[PDB]
Amino acid sequence: KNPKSDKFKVKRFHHIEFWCGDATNVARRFSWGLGMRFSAKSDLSTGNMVHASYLLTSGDLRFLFTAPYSPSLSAGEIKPTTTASIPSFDHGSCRSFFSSHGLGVRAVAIEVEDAESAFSISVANGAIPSSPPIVLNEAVTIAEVKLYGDVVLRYVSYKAEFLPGFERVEDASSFPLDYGIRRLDHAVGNVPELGPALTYVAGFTGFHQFAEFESGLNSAVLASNDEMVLLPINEPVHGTKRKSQIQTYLEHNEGAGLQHLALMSEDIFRTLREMRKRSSIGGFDFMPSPPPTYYQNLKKRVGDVLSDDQIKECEELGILVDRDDQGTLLQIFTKPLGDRPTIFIEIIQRVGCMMYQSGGCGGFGKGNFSELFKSIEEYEK
Amino acid sequence: KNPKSDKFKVKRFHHIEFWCGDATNVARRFSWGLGMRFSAKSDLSTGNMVHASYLLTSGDLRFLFTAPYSPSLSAGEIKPTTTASIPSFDHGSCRSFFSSHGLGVRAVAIEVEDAESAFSISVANGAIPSSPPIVLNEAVTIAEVKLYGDVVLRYVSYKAEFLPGFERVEDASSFPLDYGIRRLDHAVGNVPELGPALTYVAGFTGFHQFAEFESGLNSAVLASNDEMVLLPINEPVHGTKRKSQIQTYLEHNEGAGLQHLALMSEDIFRTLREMRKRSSIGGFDFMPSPPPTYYQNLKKRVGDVLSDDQIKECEELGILVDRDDQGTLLQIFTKPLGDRPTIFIEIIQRVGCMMYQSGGCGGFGKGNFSELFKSIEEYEK
Ligand SMILES: Cc1c(C(=O)C2=C(O)CCCC2=O)ccc2c1n(Cc1ccccc1)c(=O)n2C
Ligand SMILES: Cc1c(C(=O)C2=C(O)CCCC2=O)ccc2c1n(Cc1ccccc1)c(=O)n2C
Ligand SMILES: [Co+2]
Ligand SMILES: [Co+2]
């Protein structure tokens, strides 16, 4: 059931911002590992004496990488006179974030009709404000509120290229990499207690629980009116035999934060061949593949949807497959993006629920827990 | 003239350590951009609850990338009980370094016969101690003293694979990249005043001035007995028309520190083709090429040494060429390795001074200042 109860008009995911110590090296690593192009920059070369920010793009997916310069470069400035292109940036806030969490997402940004309004209603409805609405070059409006831990939900709205004060990147320096990733599908939070986190976020957004159908976690998914903005949240399950990975996240991250980004590919086979090609030459590693007993049970579950040639292709690439009642999903998970066992990336492709494709089509793969356990026990014997 | 006056026996450059906020992303970027292989690791997977350290290797070149984990992982440990593989590491020291300087070299490490002795004599001879000598697993000894700014000279000696507590890297995860780089040739410091820096370092090492033959800098080179360890130092020249890059380093780095690493290639043409191939797909950019007026004057200067086919090859790759009285050098410079206009890398190849090749053969390219000015003025007209 979809109550369509957003308290303000929410369009789509707009970008994801990583807070870094060196934005250049993370950016060039993500670019190659994921096949994202260098699109825009705000840095010393553009008159930004405060922070270096580099934007990567694939399809509609926007990854922003930001690090602080020495505060001494802008010691003479004040907020009215700043050269920061993102006015919410704070040197001390950024340094404390990276040193507390390591590499991680600072902002999940969603486009909205009216950012100042979305901020006002949000804060009226329980949101802890993080950065008040600011109007950039009479063109774009930006506002921030707390989401969980040190992660903010960022509202951006346009009266009528990324943000003012960014420059488009030198096409000689900008190589058109592309491995098929097109857009952000969901962004997932880890918290110590799911109940109060859900109440708070649903409280100020109007987002509703997105319905779906003894290991790991309890989770629930918050969704906008058209279920195109999707913000799941996990909490750990204590007491089990095997330690909760959610609980391992919270230990190494020093508390709650963004756990994974799910990136939709238009061709999850091309994407996964291209990323796997580069795993050991600067790219990303993937979680261990499931045992062929898995793929030996996929015919009896999705053989309707995928040909035996296409299941074998899942087998070589290590792709996992789950099924809702309206659609099917193909998914795989990278190893953690940095030093700590915290944030990782998910690649997904959704098949079904054509009307455009409705959001969440197929769910989020919580069935793959049961099938992997079954598979593992099958393969053992 | 070579007084051969080292106060302790110095062998060769052993490794260079970068202090990072995320060692994984810097490491994977350097690996691809430079063609260095993943050799050893010390991290959570090896029982190191303190820091993540990843070693890249090309030839005899060792690049170590280290970042701190959350201090809460080792809150219960004490120095006697630490799980750090590098006992000199300090969480607070590392965080303060990265936040003061951004990405940069923390340690220039040289092998020596006796590390405890090298430390004792050094400190007896004016060296500010930084980490006392420590004996790792009865096998290796490690000691540190201050070099300049927050950079330390690290002594390592072996009684008889990198360091104890590192593991050799999974050969599946370890791809044999190689673009021809073989060893570290020199490591160069920027300081505000060259005189006191030279007096101090030469003071406790016994290193001697290495002789050579209105823009930029004043520099001088300290060298070991066999001139295989080479530690030049720059200071800025104020008052010029155009700002000193040395002075720009000191502003953005928040003081003195390591300015560039010169890496010897056995084939500077293969190396530069392979790095240039990857400049815009995650690798390194290079300083702007000199104008062809440069290469139109190289026949009259090194035509003895390089064929007209080989000068044209310099022309496509942007290689610079200088000449001492004993040998010739080919050199080029990358753009800064990270966000700040601070550290960069130099690729070099030396031709001449065969006896093995003596160190510094050809010098360090200070003649290319004059020739570039001449060239620029030539091309203008
Ligand atoms: C991350 C993930 C998902 C996933 O994305 C997902 C959502 O999007 C929202 C709803 C709930 C959910 O589970 C699905 C299946 C998975 C999986 N992981 C990695 C893993 C498991 C446990 C704790 C930390 C990390 C795994 O092994 N399987 C088999
Ligand atoms: C770094 C460098 C060197 C070089 O390596 C070198 C040493 O190894 C030790 C002795 C002195 C020395 O100069 C040679 C020529 C260069 C050069 N640079 C970049 C640059 C210039 C000015 C201030 C910052 C950076 C440039 O443009 N030319 C033409
Ligand atoms: Co997911
Ligand atoms: Co040099």
Q: Which ligand is nearest to the CA of B213?
A: 2
Give the strand order in the sheet containing B181-190: B208-209, B217-223, B230-236, B181-190, B257-265, B344-352, B327-333, B320-323
A365 lines ligand 1 (CB under 6 A): yes
Q: Rounded to whole angstroms, what are the CA distances from B110 to B114, B116, B144, B153, B167?
A: 11, 13, 10, 8, 21
Nearest Cα neighbor of A56 from A45, A46, A47, A65 is A65
- Please, which residues 55-74 of chain B have a Cβ atom closer than 8 Å to chain A? 67, 69-70, 72-73
- Compare CB distances from B31 to A26, A173, A282 and report the shortest one's residue: A282
- Any idea what the Cα angle at residue B346 is, between residues B22 and B3, rounded to 5°? 110
Dihedral angle, C-alpha B299, B304, B305, B311, nearest 10 °:
20
**Residue B324 contacts residue B363 (beta carbons within 8 Å):** yes
CA A68 to chain B, closest CA, distance in angstroms equals 9
**Residues written for chain B:** 381
Rounded CA-CA distance A166/B356 in Å is: 52
Q: Is A217 in the pocket of ligand 1 (CB under 6 A)?
A: yes
- Across the interface, of A69, A280, A339, the residue whose CB is closest to B23 is A339
SS3 B295: helix
Count other Cβ atoms within 10 Å, centred on residue B320: 23
**Whole-angstrom distance, CA of residue B149 vs CA of residue A92:** 23
Compute the distance from residue B256 Cα to the ligand 4 centre, in Å: 17
Strand B327-333 to strand B230-236: parallel, antiparallel, or no bridges (unpaired)? unpaired
Quick check: A21 and B21 CB within 8 A? yes
Query: Is A311's C-beta closer than 6 angstroms to any atom of ligand 1?
Result: no
* Residues composing chain A: 381
Distance CA A170, CA A38 (A): 9
Helix (H) or strand (E) holding B123: helix B115-124
From CA A219, how far away is CA A366, in angstroms rounded?
Answer: 10
B177–A281 C-beta distance less than 8 A: yes
Conformational region of residue A118, where left means phi above 0, alpha means psi within -120 to 50, and beta covers everything else: alpha
Tokens of A255: 């508390």
Question: Do B173 and A100 count as a contact with CB atoms less than 8 A apart?
Answer: no
Per-position DSSP letters for B154-181, written without gaps between them? EEEEE----STT-EE--TTT-----SSE
Quick one: which of B151, B76, B87 has its CA closest to B115? B87
What is chain A's Cα-based Rg?
A: 21
Binding pocket residue ranges, ligand 2, CB within 6 Å: B 186, 188, 216-217, 219, 232, 245-246, 260, 262, 333, 346, 364-366, 368-369, 372
Residue A323, phi then psi, degrees to nearest 5: -145, 125
State whether the beta carbon of A216 lies less than 6 angstroms from ligand 1: yes
C-alpha to C-alpha distance for B46 and B66, rounded to whole angstroms:
14
DSSP-derived 3-state class of residue B367: helix
Cβ contact (<8 Å) for B72 and A251? yes
For the CA of B249, the closest atom of ligand 2 is 24
Residues from chain A contacting residue B72 (CB–CB below 8 Å):
251, 254
Q: Please list, residue by residue across A17-56, b when 16 or more beta carbons sit within 10 angstroms of its beta carbon and e when fewer do.
A: bbbbbbbbbbbbbbbbbbbbbbbbbbbbeeebbbbbbbbb
Which is nearest to A264 in space by CA: A179, A327, A366? A179
Between the alpha carbon of residue B145 and those of residues A30, B91, B175, B228, B233, the distances in Å are: 36, 18, 35, 20, 17
Asked if A26 reaches chain B (Cβ–Cβ under 8 Å), the answer is: yes
Contact A174 B285 (CB under 8 A): no
Using CB atoms and an 8 Å cut-off, which of residues 250-309 of chain B contact chain A? Answer: 251-254, 279-283, 285
Technique employed here was X-ray
Q: How far is B381 from chain A (nearest CA, A)?
A: 28
Q: Quick one: closest CA in B to A91, which residue?
A: B99
Nearest alpha carbon to residue B346 among B268, B249, B252: B268
Q: Does A105 touch chain B (CB under 8 A)?
A: no
Taking the C-alpha atoms of residue A315 and residue A289, their distance in angstroms, rounded to an integer, is 8
Cα→Cα distances A124→A11, A31, A63, A66, B36, Å: 21, 39, 30, 30, 54
**Sequence spans of domains, chain B:** 10-173, 181-380
Chain A CA closest to residue B281: A32
Q: How many whole angstroms from its chain centre is CA B175?
A: 23
Nearest CA in chain A to B283: A28
CA distances from B209 to B255, B284, B322 (A): 24, 32, 20
| Atom 26, ligand 1: residue with shortest CA distance | A369
Paired sense of beta strands A151-158 and A104-112, if any: parallel
Q: Which residue of B has its CA nearest to A99?
A: B95
How far is the C-alpha of A202 from the C-alpha of A6, rounded, in Å? Answer: 9
Residues B63, B36: contact at Cβ < 8 Å? Answer: yes
Contact residues, chain A, for B281 at CB < 8 Å: 31-32, 175, 177
Q: Which ligand ends up closest to the CA of A221?
A: 1
* A313 annotated ligand binder: no
Tokens coding B174: 């370890």
| Contact criterion met (CB < 8 Å) for B70 and A340 | yes
Partnered with residue B209 across adjacent β-strands are B222
- Ranges of beta strands (E only) in chain B are 10-19, 37-42, 51-58, 61-68, 104-112, 129-136, 140-148, 151-158, 167-168, 181-190, 208-209, 217-223, 230-236, 257-265, 320-323, 327-333, 344-352
Ligand 2 centre to CA of B213 (Å) is 15
In whole angstroms, what is the distance from residue B29 CA to residue B282 CA? 6
b (16+ CB within 10 A) / e for B348-378? bbbbbbeeeeebbbbbbbebbeebbeebeee
Instruction: Considering the domain delimited by B10-173, tell me its CATH architecture.
Output: Roll (3.10)
What DSSP element (H or E) covers B277?
helix B268-277
Using alpha carbons only, how large is chain B's radius of gyration in Å?
21
Using DSSP, state whether B67 is helix, strand or coil. Answer: strand
Where do we find the tokens 């004016």? Answer: B126
Within this chain, domains A10-173 and A181-380 share the same CATH topology: yes
Please, what CATH class does the domain formed by A181-380 belong to? Answer: alpha beta
CB contact burial B243-255 (16+ within 10 A = b; e otherwise): ebbbbebbbbbbe
B295 Cα to the center of ligand 2, angstroms? 19
* C-alpha–C-alpha distance, residues B49 and A249, integer Å: 15
Is A109 within 8 Å of A15 (Cβ atoms)? yes
Three-class secondary structure assignment of A167-204: EECCCCCCCCCCCCEEEEEEEEEECCCHHHHHHHHHHH
